[PDB]
Amino acid sequence: SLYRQRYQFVKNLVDQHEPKKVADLGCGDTSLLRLLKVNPCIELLVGVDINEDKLRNLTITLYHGSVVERDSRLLGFDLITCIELIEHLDSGDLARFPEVVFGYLSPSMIVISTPNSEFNPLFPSRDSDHKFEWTRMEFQTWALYVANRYDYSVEFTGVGEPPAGAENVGYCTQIGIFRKNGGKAHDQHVYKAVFTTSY
Ligand SMILES: C[S@@+](CC[C@H](N)C(=O)[O-])C[C@H]1O[C@@H](n2cnc3c(N)ncnc32)[C@H](O)[C@@H]1O
């Protein structure tokens, strides 16, 4: 339902900008990668996840690894996505996350999605699934800070519109699209490749 919408958001973005090198950080069961490989613009498609069990002309590679460690094999990418990841990082990792993804990796575009804790109406269905949840203001102040620090511009959108009678208090999933200002523009191998294929 909503995960479908998130994936389709990313697919639409890929169709629009045709990135050649795409990485999904916190890729989970690799569903998003499976969807994106459809598009022939992509020449390199990479997934990274700390959960090894979930991972068990075109090159596709899956790495067991953490978003807060610098691996040089993820340098020079066109698009990096972090879909529903940041709300599972503890304060330390959250603090390190931008210096690695924006500072070190420095891709042309980054997409970050996270729940809008203010979403109206809250659908009854747990909060204990993740570490934290952010309001729109919390996400946007964080995202603007990161944007200004690393010389990206950030566009806010999301997926999952309020149902027709509800007061609009944002999308269910809030999304920041970060674009490197000006556009494009030693080996540190840390990740362990779990799977790779090329053809
Ligand atoms: C809520 S799931 C999102 C999965 C996928 N992105 C999606 O939208 O379907 C969060 C994922 O992030 C992974 N993860 C959590 N911390 C991570 C870290 N520090 N480095 C890489 N992956 C991490 C988890 O194992 C999990 O697969």
Task: Give the type of residue at 96.
Answer: R
Give the HSE-up count for residue 48: Cα atoms under 13 Å, Cβ half-sphere.
21
Q: Render the burial of 81-100: b for 16+ CB within 10 Å, e for the rest.
A: bbbbbbbbbeeebbebbbeb
The technique is X-ray
| Structural domain boundaries, residue 7 | 1-199
- CA 167–ligand 1 middle distance (angstroms): 31
Q: Check which CATH number belongs to the domain holding 39 and give it.
A: 3.40.50.150
What residues contact 82, with CB distance under 8 A and at least 6 apart? 24, 25, 26, 67, 101, 110, 111, 112, 113
> What's phi and psi for 77, nearest 5 deg?
-85, 160
Using most ligand atoms within 8 A of CB, pick from 7, 29, 49, 70 the residue to mutate for ligand 1: 49
Q: How many domains is the chain partitioned into structurally? A: 1
- Ligand-binding annotation for 87, yes or no, is yes
Nearest CA residue ID for atom 4, ligand 1: 28
Give the HSE-up count for residue 174: Cα atoms under 13 Å, Cβ half-sphere.
24
Nearest CA residue ID for atom 20, ligand 1: 66
Residue 181 DSSP SS3: coil
CB within 6 Å of ligand 1 — which residues? 3, 25-28, 31, 48-51, 54, 66-68, 83-85, 88, 93
Nearest CA residue ID for atom 24, ligand 1: 26
How far apart, in whole angstroms, are the C-alpha atoms of residue 72 and residue 93?
Answer: 19
Using most ligand atoms within 8 A of CB, pick from 22, 25, 31, 50 the residue to mutate for ligand 1: 50
How far apart, in whole angstroms, are the C-alpha atoms of residue 95 and residue 58?
Answer: 34
Index of the ligand 1 atom closest to the CA of residue 24: 6
Closest CA relative to residue 152, chosen from 160, 143, 164, 161: 143
- Ligand-binding annotation for 145, yes or no, is no
Index of the ligand 1 atom closest to the CA of residue 67: 20
Question: Which residue in this structure is represented by tokens 């996400």?
Answer: 139
